[PDB]
Amino acid sequence: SISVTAPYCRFEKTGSPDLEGDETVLGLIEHGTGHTDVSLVDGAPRTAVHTTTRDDEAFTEVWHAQRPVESGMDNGIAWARTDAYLFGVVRTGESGRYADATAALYTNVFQLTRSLGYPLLARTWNYVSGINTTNADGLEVYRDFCVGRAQALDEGGIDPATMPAATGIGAHGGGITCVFLAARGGVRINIENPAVLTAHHYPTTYGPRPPVFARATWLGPPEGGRLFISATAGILGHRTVHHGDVTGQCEVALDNMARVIGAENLRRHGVQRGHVLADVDHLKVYVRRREDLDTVRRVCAARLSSTAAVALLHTDIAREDLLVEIEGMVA
Ligand SMILES: O=C(O)CCc1cccc(C(=O)O)c1
């Protein structure tokens, strides 16, 4: 009856003119060599995150759905909504300590989704400055971030199984930035990977509080819906594999992505049609070492579609021994 479009992505050149005047823009994330505050630009939430080290790798990640009906800012979160979907962005400053601030940020996200009427989270991203550095309290920043996220779920009475696809990736400055998509209602199916341990079941080696996220999320009606794939690493079970071997890690990351979106895994989660890697688009490929970026580019180019939008970003991964990760979606 009512015309509805589920969220989708475009990659654009930062600083390039809006040639087409596309009313469907929800919000914008500028990947590059610095950061900014979060604000609304003509109704569209925007911020810049410091996710690479060369300006010639900068680009804008633009989320779309249909003409937004309302935008605002609450508790540091800039948001835009259509009647069916919500996009938000929020950040907390560079600091010696992050758990308490992260718990507050996620509390504010959960509260906004409840208050506005978009309770089904569909996708989250966390751009974590100094993700492998040690904080002022002597704890790795990623672990400090995980404590805060986990605390917010308890503060909100949130079932960890409801957390959707995610990314937890480094930045080179700018504290912690969280981006999210949420839905008014409808279909939101969180998907696991049969050879990868569920994140919030990770053993305490990775603690003191485990990560929490799904390996992919299906959002929306069977026709028109989207498959959002988490940032995906070279892990089997919970374990990092191919230590020191970025090619092997990249191959396993791509294998994990293919497994998550494959026909039989999707069927087992109630999703009716399967996919292959050539179907994935709007991929971001995070690479720890500058000297590995071309190596990784070539591995990916041998498996991804030649028409897929692919952006490589030079930045750290949630574990020091992870060298590469890939996220993307099927529209
Ligand atoms: O555990 C992993 O599989 C690799 C790291 C990873 C991937 C996706 C999301 C996160 C997060 O903490 O939000 C972390």
Domain boundaries of the chain, sorted by first residue: 1-331
How is 148-175 classified by DSSP, letter by letter? HHHHHHHHHT--GGG--B--EEEESSSS
Contacts of 149 (CB under 8 A, 6+ apart): 102, 103, 106, 126, 209, 211, 212
What's the gap between Cα 226 and its chain centre? 14
**Structure token pair of residue 236:** 């089997």
Is the Cβ–Cβ distance between 40 and 78 less than 8 Å?
A: yes
C-alpha–C-alpha distance, residues 24 and 53, integer Å: 30
| Ligand 1 atom at shortest distance from the alpha carbon of 196 | 3
The span from the CA of 318 to the CA of 299, in Å, is: 21
| Residues in Cβ contact with 196 at an 8 Å cutoff, skipping those fewer than 6 apart | 215, 235, 236, 237, 238, 256
Provide the residue count of the chain: 331
User: What is the spatial distance between Cα 82 and Cα 69, in angstroms, rounded to a whole number?
Assistant: 5
30, 61, 140, 325: which is the annotated catalytic residue?
Answer: 325
Phi then psi for residue 169, to 5 deg, are -135, 160
Q: Which residues line ligand 1 (CB under 6 A)?
A: 126, 166-168, 199, 211, 213, 230-231, 233, 235, 318
Ligand 1: nearest atom to the Cα of 318: 5
Method used to obtain the model: X-ray
- The encoded tokens of residue 58 equal 């900068």
First to last CA, the chain: 22
Residue of 143, 67, 138, 54 whose CA lies nearest to 96 = 138
CA distances from 35 to 30, 62, 127, 180 (A): 8, 16, 11, 18
State the pairing for strand pair 168-171/120-129: parallel
Distance, CA of 249 to CA of 269 (rounded, Å):
26
Instruction: For residue 128, give the 3-state DSSP assignment.
Output: strand
Rounded Cα–Cα distance for residues 301 and 103 (Å): 39
CB-based contacts of 251: which residues, under 8 Å, 6+ apart? 234, 242, 299
Which residue from 106, 230, 254, 286 has its CB within 8 A of the most atoms of ligand 1, so it is best to mutate? 230
CA distances to 82, 188, 215, 220 from 4, in Å: 9, 15, 26, 10
Separation of CA 107 from chain center = 18
> What is the CB neighbour count within 10 angstroms for residue 258?
18
CA-to-CA distance for 74 and 11, rounded, in angstroms?
27
Orientation of helix 99-116 relative to helix 141-156, angle to 10°: 40
